[PDB]
Amino acid sequence: KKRIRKDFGKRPQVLDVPYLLSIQLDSFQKFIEQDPEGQYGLEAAFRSVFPIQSYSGNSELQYVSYRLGEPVFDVQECQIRGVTYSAPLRVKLRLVIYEREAPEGTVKDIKEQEVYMGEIPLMTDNGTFVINGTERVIVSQLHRSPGVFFDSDKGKTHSSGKVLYNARIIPYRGSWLDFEFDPKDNLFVRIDRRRKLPATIILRALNYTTEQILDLFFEKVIFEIRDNKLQMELVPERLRGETASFDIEANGKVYVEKGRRITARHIRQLEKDDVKLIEVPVEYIAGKVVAKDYIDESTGELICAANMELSLDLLAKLSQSGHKRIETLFTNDLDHGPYISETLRVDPTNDRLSALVEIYRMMRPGEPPTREAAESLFENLFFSEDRYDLSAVGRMKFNRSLLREEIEGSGILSKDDIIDVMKKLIDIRNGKGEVDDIDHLGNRRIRSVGEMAENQFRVGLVRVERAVKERLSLGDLDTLMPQDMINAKPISAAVKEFFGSSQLSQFMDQNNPLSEITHKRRISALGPGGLTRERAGFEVRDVHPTHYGRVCPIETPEGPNIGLINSLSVYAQTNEYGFLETPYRKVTDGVVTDEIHYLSAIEEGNYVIAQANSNLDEEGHFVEDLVTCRSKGESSLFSRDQVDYMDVSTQQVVSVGASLIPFLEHDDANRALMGANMQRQAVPTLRADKPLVGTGMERAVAVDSGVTAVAKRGGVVQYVDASRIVIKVNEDEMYPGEAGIDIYNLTKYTRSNQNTCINQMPCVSLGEPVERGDVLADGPSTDLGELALGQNMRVAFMPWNGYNFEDSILVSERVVQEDRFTTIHIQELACVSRDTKLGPEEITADIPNVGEAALSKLDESGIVYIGAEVTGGDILVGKVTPKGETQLTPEEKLLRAIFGEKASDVKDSSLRVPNGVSGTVIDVQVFTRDGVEKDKRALEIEEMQLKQAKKDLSEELQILEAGLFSRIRAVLVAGGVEAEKLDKLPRDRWLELGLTDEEKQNQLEQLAEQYDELKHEFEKKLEAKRRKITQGDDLAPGVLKIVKVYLAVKRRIQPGDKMAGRHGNKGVISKINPIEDMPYDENGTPVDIVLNPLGVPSRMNIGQILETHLGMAAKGIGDKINAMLKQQQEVAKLREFIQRAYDLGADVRQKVDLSTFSDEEVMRLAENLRKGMPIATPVFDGAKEAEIKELLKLGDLPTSGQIRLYDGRTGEQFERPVTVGYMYMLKLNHLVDDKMHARSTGSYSLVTQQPLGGKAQFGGQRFGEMEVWALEAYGAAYTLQEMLTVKSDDVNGRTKMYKNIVDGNHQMEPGMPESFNVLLKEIRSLGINIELEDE
């Protein structure tokens, strides 16, 4: 159901765009219901254990189920009062004192009731955690992926330059375990990023001897002492790249003698003959390193220890002892370096006790290392679930790094896993395997909202674990008291500090619908457990090859956080394990199938991707033999049958913001990055019309977000209105016949986070059929499904007497008069009644020193009336604070005595509207304290809220009653047709009298149950709302009532407001410029805006010119349609023109015309096309220059873009033909009014007497060092002296100079500033003394 189309683009749809806010919704949806992942998996540290220090045998708490069970205050009421969208966290425990076998406590068991373990905040319908009234939005984290990875560290580390590789195991919840090399090839280890210690110490800590450690890494080489000589187990492959020091011979044949080197040919000769036994000298064995210990069996004396260097003397003792097997290490200087031997050489600890004590001293340096403390500390490092965890994902990722078979395993690391990581690191050091990449997407998980909340809850449970264990261990009473054991403060504060206090939970930038969707789909690399700012570097921030498909290259912002914060792609989606997947069409060797597969970061590199730019046949195979394709991280070529996969759509890459740009391909990437940032800040204008030169994706963007009210169940519209909309379901209702209907409330005239007027308006008319999933009621910055950030302006590219200077915009008076860029704001002014030691501040209308203007705006109580026009100076809420004493100077007492005293003991602190702004009061409010005298206006407003809500609920019940009675009467007229006899009965008679047997009477029983349910639900909802309305309203811990005043203002397009286009075309409005003196053509039509042409050529944003030229073609067909509509029907059913308009796009592909339909139905679509024809140029496969030239025809226009225009003031024609068109501009945020400050004199700070405000005036402008350098350069000593002392921070100098300025003397009369004098006192406060001598 749509009365507007517009069509363009060549390539097919294939796969439609998914839910835009799927990642935000699905992540939080996981953390709630499912087992071993979300909420249940969050309590993995409190599923089995919680053993109370081995007291009463063992014992436990044991979690068993939970559930939330509805809300408390709801989302709408949580916006008004300062309270989050909360939901009570119940959880049934079961305290038991069951041991293993016999004695102590004997199987009690309670099955205790559920306890309130804090309160976790729930997500709204469209992804938003409401906290204390504010909207809020939790952005996704892009941290480093858990598991293990070998870092490069290549280049100049410490001069010379020689690789220095290193391994590093990153845990999910535990301590880090690094493993790095040095210049001398020594293996170190870093426990939780600490001081370096020998890697063999960790092996000793896991109960491994020096001989056992030697047999793990290096290969042994046995030597035999027989027949008074030295033999050796020769291995041919081991002698590759080594010089022969002795005569290598076997079986009476000298293969390689002693001198020259051993080549690969000698290895083939040795391997062919099968030589595994040859004689060797004493000097050759001296070079090797002995593996195990060797004691002399004759005397019992130890001849050298493990890992010691051999010698001529040592080998003589070993031969004399009578040992038949001399175990030694082989090694080399290429593929098998002696790293573990060198690490053992510089290792102090020789056993498990010394290793654990050394590790205990390194970790916790202070207390003396004991037996239990040293073992338990090492045990709680990488061998315990409470103090170490790789999760289900990191262990799977660790297995892939080590080349394992299975992907499942334990959380904590084993003894074999550490040795395997060290073995792979040793292989990577030599020449086996390659290094990993940090910038690649394979080692970068997407930690969303669900993971962070469960992680914070895991920390909160760890806090309560020590309290529960200590209390249960000490106490041993027969009574349970399990609900009172676990406190609510620890769990609630853990969740509350993360949700609306910690980083990542930023304010929801809801200027427009695109800003909310872009904010929800954002992904930052910094925050809790990741990057920051000072680190970061060139890598990571730069756009990697794996980003193509996952994230947008252009959408990342400027400044300090450029590269760290990247937006998610359109077709992208988060994987199950944590990685970022991306869709791709399956091509089964030649023919491209209709199926789609989500390829991971690592998985995508293996297969051969293919671009969507290459055209295909009618159905199946490709056109060209060789086309463009991506494979192995490079954009090479391939054969026709070689391609495995294909691109899903043309806009697979890039974000939703970049996709909204019309001619994105024609614009530069630098300007496109600015153009993405230019959007979102586009404020919601009054009556937002649909954009002419569109993309097509804007239709999905508005419907994706919760701004526009989409139809849940399709049917027919019953009652349409500004207040609400009600649609009868009609076609296929629910299972049980419990009435049709579908009430849509639709919020209207509400303030946003950026002070923007958020409202909803009914697009669909009364008595109109509508299908499921369509825009019933539109929202702010939209036009019946299609999004609209601004309004279309008749632009003109030409110079205009220095008005459009360095990217300045020259507007027209017709734009301001029509109210095209008129922004409606909604400010909220507060007025808190405080309570001092002297007395309590009361809100009253009897304010001291006030005339007739008080009672004009304010009421009898002292609050402004709803709908009164206010200005900068008028009082909104009257209030006075008690303050006696005074004293009063002699002149003031005599002055008061002359004109009546009236010196009351009370000051004034009424909530007045700020000087400058002005508007109308929309809605007042009053949050009264619990146990205080309620005001007359407060009771009147509360009575209005109670009456309106009760009438709304009563009318809501009446709407359901009309549908329910119609549904019952429809069912009742099939079997027992009363017909004209019916429709003259009461209410009670209608309920009675049912049908016969079969499916009729049984359905009517459930209808009566649903009718009685609605009757009971009306009283329950009314009683709940009545209790909530007339509640205590407990505010903050200050005192007394408070009064909020929502006043709306309407600002016009003043000269200075920052207005910009869609292709990074930044601008500022210069002057007003009347319609009489503006650029006009042969006809009477003038120009809406006049932009400078010099800006288009400097920055490569040529797509803006394409948007202007195509906009003229879009407007041209609209003028032709308006010409047909005006002066009667004329043609009457002119479908051939509209069919030719839709069809004629170079006769390419992808279009539909009015084949079906009828008269009047076409007139609905034709009336919408009067303003503009509208176009949908996608992004990559957009409208070409030839198609735009074709679009220039039909509606009658110059096939070029140029057009001769008269001046307006003079009336003469311009020399060159100027480029006129329709550019889709938009009024951005910031603007004038807010960005405009001035201050002569105001308040000052207590610490240092320097200009500051906010309460009444604004704070003074800062000079700084850069300004002082310019003042010193020019030689303005008096200007710098006045700015430093008297103008800024001189106590006596400011008042003296101000008195001189009032008298007309000027001068200065300066002195020593308070900033310097405080430094003198601060320096003198210490032991040093500073004194200013005279001369």
Next chain:
Amino acid sequence: VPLDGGRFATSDLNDLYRRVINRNNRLKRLLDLAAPDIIVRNEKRMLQEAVDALLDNGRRGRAITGSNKRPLKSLADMIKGGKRVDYSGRSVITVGPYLRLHQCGLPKKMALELFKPFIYGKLELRGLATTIKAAKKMVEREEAVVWDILDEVIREHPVLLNRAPTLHRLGIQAFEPVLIEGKAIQLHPLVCAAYNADFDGDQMAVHVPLTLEAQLEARALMMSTNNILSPANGEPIIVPSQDVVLGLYYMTRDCVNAKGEGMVLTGPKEAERLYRSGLASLHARVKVRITEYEKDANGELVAKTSLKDTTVGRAILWMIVPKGLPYSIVNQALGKKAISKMLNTCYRILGLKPTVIFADQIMYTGFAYAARSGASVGIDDMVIPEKKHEIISEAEAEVAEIQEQFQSGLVTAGERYNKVIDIWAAANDRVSKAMMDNLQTETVINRDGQEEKQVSFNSIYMMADSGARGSAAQIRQLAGMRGLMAKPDGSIIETPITANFREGLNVLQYFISTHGARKGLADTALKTANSGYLTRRLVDVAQDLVVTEDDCGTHEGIMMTPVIEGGDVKEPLRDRVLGRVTAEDVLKPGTADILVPRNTLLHEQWCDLLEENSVDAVKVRSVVSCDTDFGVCAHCYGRDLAR
């Protein structure tokens, strides 16, 4: 101090002083009762810890306390490592064509709030307000006549404007306050280049000179009229920007025929012919009576009437030129680089007042003529070359032959990418040269009999050949093609962007171009902060010395010569010696000529050319040498400033 509704806000020094007082009091009590050696010594160490923490925490451990996890701010921390000022404000910038050089559009509400005390004093002095409180009530309720009093207050009272990124001395500049009905601060287009300011939502701050000497300092030193020339280089800082230069470029450009002919006139009378149609504008080599004016030796002015073959635009633009100067030949050239040179020569010959009025006249005439021209940027302006596909196919054929050679050994496969990059770079030069040669000349026209050529009036080419933000590389990227794109690793890609901005761009090439845009923005962010980091070290070291002791003796100095890269590259630059004091009579081919301490003037520097190319070495006094004690000699320094 008590905050809002209880909850006091105390400093960390109160906690440190209380801890030191408590430990010292316990130590005093310990030295009185039973005195154990362990207890008394430990309390003394605790008193040392409290006293050390109070003076300066910093190093050893850091004493926490006071709930918060962060350390307490000690006395040393308070003074270890931005001066807010009253009578100031800020607002969004805007263009103001009608304003003069020494003028800036200040808002009515902002100027009223800024000059509060002056308005109160001026009101009470004349009459109207009986007292100061009455003037405050009269000023609060803006009652018409107060605005008239505000006009008198800011008549000859300079307001100091200022930008955010204050690099040089020209960042802060003063101007006469002009009242404007609006909420945005207007500014002069000529002085926008000095501040490095654009109209993309940039805001500037204003400051009012309260003191009498401060107002004189703003007028004499900090004024925009005084700051004509740059401090770094002798050339003009407030030269005509994009819009004005494009209009002056349009005012030249001699197009043959097209309502041309040699219809003679006398200067000012040609303006009547231009406004009344008939004749075109940049038509032909039309003759006209040019009344020139020159001076020599004894100063004065000497007239010189003559019939020079100029254009209608050059004849009309000649009225804007001052009394002095060469005349005709300045306007006869064009508007691009010589537009700034004409202003520099006018400033050197005439003075400050004549050059300032000429700058305002050139800005007004440039803006008006640029409006009358109507130069646009259509789709057909950037005309692509016909031999782009042919050159790309030929370059791809050469690269295919090189790849085919590498397949069968022959050439060095290790360095084949460098030679292939040279082939693509040569193809990029061929596409750039073909696009430039076609877009530069072009055209046909009808010179009397019809059949001729001159230069393409194609908007972008006119913008490119007249400053106006239009380089050769940007124009090459638009119509021609983007060259060798940079990769993330550092190396260049072997397949450059064959397509351009005029044509369609593929997803692969745009993805590759995103790395250049991301790296360009990131490097610009780093280099911007790094420039200020280097400037802080330069300022900290240098900002003690000043020119003092009038002018000391000392002849010795650096022998100034032309920076010769001509040994094996052809590159000369003999503009170093200008406004520099001579060491001592620095010879001449014969005798005499140069004086002892004579500063090389602008005209006297031209006299060095009269001594031929042989004299390319002159000893000059510099700031490196000089026999001054604690400063610098005024002669040894030079002159190069705005003055």
Next chain:
Amino acid sequence: GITKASLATESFISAASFQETTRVLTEAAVAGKRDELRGLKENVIVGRLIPAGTGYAYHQDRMRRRAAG
């Protein structure tokens, strides 16, 4: 270098601004130094007329005035 040259200076208050304040103030407290203010940076923090441009003559008059004692 520029950093090495800027490190050495006569006035302690000027050195206390840019460089490490704890080291400069402690060293200047040991030996009884005194900033006879001729510098620009040291005079700016005190809040007086800078010895350059519109000043200079005021500083030169005060410098000559401090020759008596």
